[PDB]
């Protein structure tokens, strides 16, 4: 059995908190991966790159294995996880844990017309990690994920079906490639648009309405 | 070698080149 030790774990185990958006709405820090597992039961893992780093010691080289893992539900939630461990399987396993903890929602929007279900970004957003800068430009309904294979795999798992991409810098650094792409896909909700201008009243925090079921 | 001495070695070499052309 799974025993939560945090308030969010307390509330997720009951029926108090059911929508991940409620966690997203109030910026509730997700420290426990099983919180994600129940509330996002349909997630997809796929390892982008496995790398061996080496620490020089007096006797010789100390080799650890580094793996990068991408999680997404193809419906607006995507997560990235990079973990180093002595064994590839352990590093892959531990990466999935933290790849789930960093899962964020994405904003699908319309290029041009708003006819049908959203197909792309609402705006052009760019992220930078190290030297890699990845820009995503909304595409028409025909043009798919015009991107490099590693960046495209992130978008397929995020549920963006049409988008452009333009990369700069040392794009052969896979780790900084995915983190910079992750920054862009996460800036979809950080950009103000006119349709969001109206003020909505602040809903009461879920930890304050069920503090009795969240205390312990 | 050191850059300053490589520069000086060429300086003395150019001076020899200039003189040997003066013979003609």
């Amino acid at each position: 059995g799974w025993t939560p030790v945090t308030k969010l774990g307390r509330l997720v185990k009951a029926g108090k908190i059911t929508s991940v958006e409620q966690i997203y709405l109030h910026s509730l820090p997700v420290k426990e991966y099983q919180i994600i597992d129940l509330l996002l039961p349909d997630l997809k893992d796929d390892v982008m790159k496995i790398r061996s780093v080496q620490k020089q010691t007096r006797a010789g080289q100390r080799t650890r294995m580094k793996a990068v893992v991408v999680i997404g539900d193809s419906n607006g939630h995507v997560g990235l996880g990079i973990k180093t461990a002595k064994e590839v399987a352990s590093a892959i396993k531990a990466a999935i844990v933290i790849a789930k903890l960093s899962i964020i929602p994405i904003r699908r929007g319309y290029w041009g017309s708003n006819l049908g279900q959203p197909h792309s970004l609402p705006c052009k957003v760019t992220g930078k990690c190290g030297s890699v800068a990845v820009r995503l430009i909304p595409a028409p309904r025909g043009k798919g994920i015009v991107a490099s294979p590693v960046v495209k795999r992130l978008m397929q798992l995020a549920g963006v079906e049409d988008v452009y991409t333009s990369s700069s810098g040392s794009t052969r650094t896979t780790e900084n490639t995915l983190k910079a792409a992750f920054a862009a896909i996460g800036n979809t909700y950080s950009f103000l648009t006119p349709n969001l201008w109206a003020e909505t009243p602040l809903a009461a925090s879920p930890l304050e309405v069920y503090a009795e079921e969240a205390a312990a | 070698m050191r850059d300053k001495w490589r520069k000086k070695r060429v300086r003395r070499l150019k001076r020899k080149r200039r003189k040997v052309r003066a013979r003609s």
Binding site: E21, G186, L192 | -
Partner: protein, 87 residues
């Protein structure tokens, strides 16, 4: 965001900061939700009834949150003659 046929295609409409109107990101772990209690005239705190402010980690990081509280509480009737528009 709303499509042609009218249903809300937007999920997770985020809140907006009360100081700088900036959107509160999904992982803005410096963002708080200040709650202040409404009081019956008998000096006792009303139960389950609070004025809610959303405050961005940007304002907190700059240390302007206290001033943003002072101006908001002054203009919402919560606070008397401590914050002044003219400095």
């Amino acid at each position: 965001m709303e499509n042609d046929k009218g249903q809300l295609v937007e999920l997770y409409v985020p809140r907006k900061c009360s100081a700088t109107n900036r959107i509160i990101k999904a992982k803005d772990h410096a963002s708080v939700q200040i709650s202040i209690a409404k009081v019956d005239e008998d000096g006792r705190a009303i139960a389950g009834e609070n004025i809610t402010y959303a405050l961005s980690g940007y304002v907190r990081g700059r240390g302007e949150a206290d001033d943003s509280l002072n101006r908001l509480a002054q203009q919402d009737g919560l606070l008397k003659n401590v914050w002044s528009y003219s400095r």
